Curated annotation (Swiss-Prot), chain A:
This is Transcription initiation factor TFIID subunit 2. Component of the TFIID basal transcription factor complex, composed of TATA-box-binding protein TBP, and a number of TBP-associated factors (TAFs), including TAF1, TAF2, TAF3, TAF4, TAF5, TAF6, TAF7, TAF8, TAF9, TAF10, TAF11, TAF12 and TAF13. Interacts with TAF2C1. Component of the TFTC-HAT complex. Disulfide bonds: none annotated. The gene is TAF2. The chain holds residues 401 to 800 of 1199 of the full protein. The lineage of its organism: Eukaryota, Metazoa, Chordata, Craniata, Vertebrata. PubMed:9418870 was unable to show an association between TAF2 and TFIID. GO terms for biological process: G2/M transition of mitotic cell cycle; mRNA transcription by RNA polymerase II; positive regulation of DNA-templated transcription; positive regulation of transcription initiation by RNA polymerase II; regulation of DNA repair; regulation of transcription by RNA polymerase II; RNA polymerase II preinitiation complex assembly; transcription initiation at RNA polymerase II promoter.
Swiss-Prot record, chain B:
It is found in: Nucleus. GO terms for biological process: DNA repair; nucleotide-excision repair; transcription by RNA polymerase II. Its main location: nucleus. The C-terminus (residues 305-462) stimulates the ATPase activity of XPB/ERCC3. It holds the Pfam family Tfb2_C. Component of the 7-subunit TFIIH core complex composed of XPB/ERCC3, XPD/ERCC2, GTF2H1, GTF2H2, GTF2H3, GTF2H4 and GTF2H5, which is active in NER. The core complex associates with the 3-subunit CDK-activating kinase (CAK) module composed of CCNH/cyclin H, CDK7 and MNAT1 to form the 10-subunit holoenzyme (holo-TFIIH) active in transcription. This is General transcription factor IIH subunit 4. One of its GO terms (molecular function) is RNA polymerase II general transcription initiation factor activity.
Length: 393, 394
């Protein structure tokens, strides 16, 4: 939301100094002259910058800062002196930074100078190349700092590389003149023997390594995984790396960004990846709800190649319909709250299917109308208004 | 073949090459079967005729002969559709060609070719001729790299050596013509003389080279008249092969003994016989030098003593199979120049890039499973631009 708004119009400036922001058509000196979208993005950027301050100075020290502010205010709140002490209930920026420096011993003045006083987000364009001879991974990260909403980042940058030997984090120093970052790569001895490949968490899984390159061990790369800067990343992986990142990652933002990047690769391996995500309980439900729409877009792009039925129909009849009647939907029992959301989002994406004539097929429209006719809600303890409203959608 | 040589020519050189004296007859004799008949038919016609008649003028059976003859003579451009009348110049020359307008020599040719082959091989005693040496060096079968030291023999040299005399001489003359064009000698004038044989400064030099090769011999202190030898127009065996890789060759000329020693170990040399052994060492030595088992087998078969001709096959299966297996035992490294890309993103997009390097001729190896295309540095400035254009198209 904030990178869309700041690249759209100028930027949000937390803590201006009194104009400080002349790129935008109102004055930021008073709350009653702000646009309402600017007020909403102001609150949004403020809580993300506080998450960044928690990233630099750990969460227990952050809660100690907040407790110190509240305790000064509550010793202030019981005095009777007319504001000799009642102004300890008012916080400022300098007092907040001083309380942070009191509890931690680190000051955050570079982070405050970059993300508060400066009003911009950063844009990262990354592309890699694997050097087989020296066994290194040559990243190439360049910033677009000449757009109207952007600024230049010179700090450190975390990158997480999943190779066959596991998941390794690397810190890159991205100075102004930097372009190529050579990080080292590990072995490929988990392709010699079939062993399980260890993940970002402690677990390990069986991966189908037939799509991987023979010479490179690395399975996927993620630039800034923890969202530790206010950034927009445009990484150029290969399509099998996006499919491996969709399947076997233990991070929901990486599964979402792989869904978002698989729309450019309409190959049938990506259809298999999104269909395996859709069938998979123990995936987070908002990833499967995105995979519905991604599968609809991919299915629209590979018409005159699609083999069987329309997308997600057989999957809908496998998950939510009767075993004896495929075209009759099961009676509504909405007590699971994840297959309820997936059931009410799957025909909405299924209706975006189009034939070679650019008209929605009469197999999906008839399916949606049979979902509407055979709807029986006399048996669940929950209402049907959102599911029926999504059927109209 | 001569058909290949003449097919590899332009119309402008072809019509000029169709000289009055002989060319119209020498090229006629090339016509394998039927095109002779059609040439005779429409030798007397001044009016072109429709192609359908020629098409239907051969029965349904054996039509492939009709199409192949028509294609061959279309390549030779003997006629033109003109809408199939023959070329007027060829018609006139052919009408003028059709009722219009030694024992010591063969030995000389044999001896001259034998001494030429002796020089080709590392024979201490051989005929000396700087022009012949440089001609053989530039023919592609010899490389010197050091004028002071005598030139060595390249890999193609051994293969050329093991060929039979007819094909050997024919290929040598083909290379002679190809290098004649490079050195600037007119190709048509020299070529017409070869055709005239089977019935200027450049002419004198060419005849001198032919005499050095032994095809012709003036015999009169280099007079205008010449008496071509048998080889100019265009024998029993002596080797006996045992089942224990033993060769008994009734050879008196050192050339045959040298040729056998090229791929066999010599044991004894009698006045009218020589004993050699075909061992792994000798055979693999020849293979490394460049020969392949096919040349050795063909050489032994062609120089097969009459005694072993009765048995079928002439060459024992054990010897032939052993030679072939010995050659197979060796498989060898290669050399090329290339550059490789990576991170090709979409699959259907990588298939379009494969056709760019294949049409230009800079593609070496492709990989659709990993997306891995090797591009030679000679055309690197053209593939990258195409890739950039594709990216721009998105």
């Amino acid at each position: 939301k904030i990178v869309a708004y700041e690249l759209k119009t100028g930027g949000v400036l937390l803590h201006p100094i009194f104009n400080p922001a002349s790129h935008l058509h109102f004055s930021i000196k008073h709350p009653h002259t702000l646009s309402w979208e600017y007020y909403s993005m102001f609150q949004c950027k403020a809580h993300l910058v506080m998450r960044l301050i928690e990233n630099r100075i750990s969460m227990e020290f952050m809660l100690q800062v907040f407790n110190k502010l509240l305790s000064l205010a509550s010793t202030a709140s019981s005095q009777k002196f007319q504001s000799h002490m009642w102004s300890q209930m008012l916080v400022s920026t300098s007092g907040f930074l001083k309380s942070i420096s009191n509890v931690s011993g680190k000051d955050i003045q570079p982070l405050i100078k970059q993300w508060v006083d400066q009003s911009g987000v950063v844009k990262f364009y990354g592309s890699f190349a694997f050097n087989r001879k020296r066994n290194v991974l040559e990243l190439e990260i360049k910033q677009d700092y000449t757009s109207p909403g952007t600024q230049k980042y010179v700090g450190p940058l975390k990158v997480t590389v999943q190779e066959l030997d596991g998941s390794f984090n690397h810190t890159l120093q991205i100075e102004e003149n930097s372009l190529k970052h050579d990080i080292p790569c590990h072995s490929k001895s988990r392709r010699n023997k079939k062993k399980k490949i260890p993940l970002m968490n402690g677990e390990e899984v069986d991966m189908d390594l037939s799509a991987m390159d023979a010479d490179s061990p690395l399975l996927w790369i993620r630039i800034d995984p923890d969202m530790s800067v206010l950034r927009k990343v445009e990484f150029e992986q290969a399509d099998f790396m996006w499919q491996y990142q969709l399947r076997y990652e233990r991070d929901v933002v990486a599964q979402q960004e792989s869904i978002l990047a698989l729309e450019k690769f309409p190959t049938p391996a990506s259809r298999l990846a999104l269909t395996d995500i859709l069938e998979q309980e123990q995936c987070f439900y908002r990833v499967r709800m995105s995979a519905c729409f991604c599968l609809a877009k991919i299915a629209n792009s590979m018409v005159s190649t699609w083999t069987g039925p329309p997308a997600m129909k057989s999957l809908f009849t496998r998950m939510f319909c009767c075993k004896s009647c495929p075209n009759i939907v099961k009676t509504n029992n909405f007590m699971s709250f994840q297959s309820y959301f997936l059931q009410k989002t799957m025909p909405v994406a299924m209706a975006l299917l189009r034939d070679v004539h650019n008209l929605c097929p009469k197999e999906v429209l008839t399916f949606i109308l049979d979902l509407i006719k055979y709807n029986d809600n006399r048996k669940n303890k929950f209402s049907d208004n959102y599911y029926r409203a999504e059927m109209i959608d | 073949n001569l058909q290949e040589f003449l097919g590899g020519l332009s119309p402008g050189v072809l019509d000029r090459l169709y000289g009055h004296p002989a060319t119209c007859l020498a090229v006629f004799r090339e016509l394998p079967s039927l095109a002779k008949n059609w040439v005779m038919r429409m030798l007397f016609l001044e009016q072109p005729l429709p192609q359908a008649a020629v098409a239907l003028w051969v029965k349904k059976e054996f039509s492939k002969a009709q199409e192949e003859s028509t294609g061959l003579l279309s390549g030779l451009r003997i006629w033109h559709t003109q809408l199939l009348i023959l070329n007027p110049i060829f018609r006139q020359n052919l009408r003028i060609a059709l009722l219009g307008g030694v024992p010591s020599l063969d030995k000389y040719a044999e001896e001259r070719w034998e001494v030429v082959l002796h020089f080709m091989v590392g024979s201490p005693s051989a005929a000396v001729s700087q022009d012949l040496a440089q001609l053989l060096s530039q023919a592609g079968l010899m490389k010197s790299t050091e004028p002071g030291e005598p030139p060595c023999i390249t890999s193609a040299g051994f293969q050329f050596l093991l060929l039979d005399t007819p094909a050997q001489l024919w290929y040598f003359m083909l290379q002679y013509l190809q290098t004649a064009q490079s050195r600037g000698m007119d190709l048509v004038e020299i070529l017409s003389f070869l055709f005239q044989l089977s019935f200027s400064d450049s002419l004198l030099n060419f005849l001198q080279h032919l005499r050095e090769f032994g095809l012709v011999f003036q015999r009169k202190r280099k007079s205008r008249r010449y008496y071509p030898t048998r080889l100019a127009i265009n024998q029993p065996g002596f080797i006996v092969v045992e089942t224990n890789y033993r060769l008994y060759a009734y050879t008196e000329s050192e050339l045959q003994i040298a040729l056998i020693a090229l791929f066999s170990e010599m044991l004894y040399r009698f006045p009218n016989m020589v004993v050699a052994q075909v061992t792994r060492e000798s055979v693999q030595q020849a293979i490394a030098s460049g020969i392949t088992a096919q040349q050795i087998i063909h050489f032994l078969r062609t120089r097969a003593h009459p005694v072993m001709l009765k048995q079928t096959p002439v060459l024992p299966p054990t010897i032939t199979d052993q030679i072939r297996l010995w050659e197979l035992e060796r498989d060898r490294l290669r050399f090329t120049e290339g550059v490789l890309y990576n991170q090709f993103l979409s699959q259907v997009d990588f298939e379009l890039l494969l056709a760019h390097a294949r049409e230009l001729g800079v593609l070496v190896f492709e990989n659709s499973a990993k997306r891995l295309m090797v591009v030679t540095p000679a055309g690197h400035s053209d593939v990258k631009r195409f890739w950039k254009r594709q990216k721009h198209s998105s």
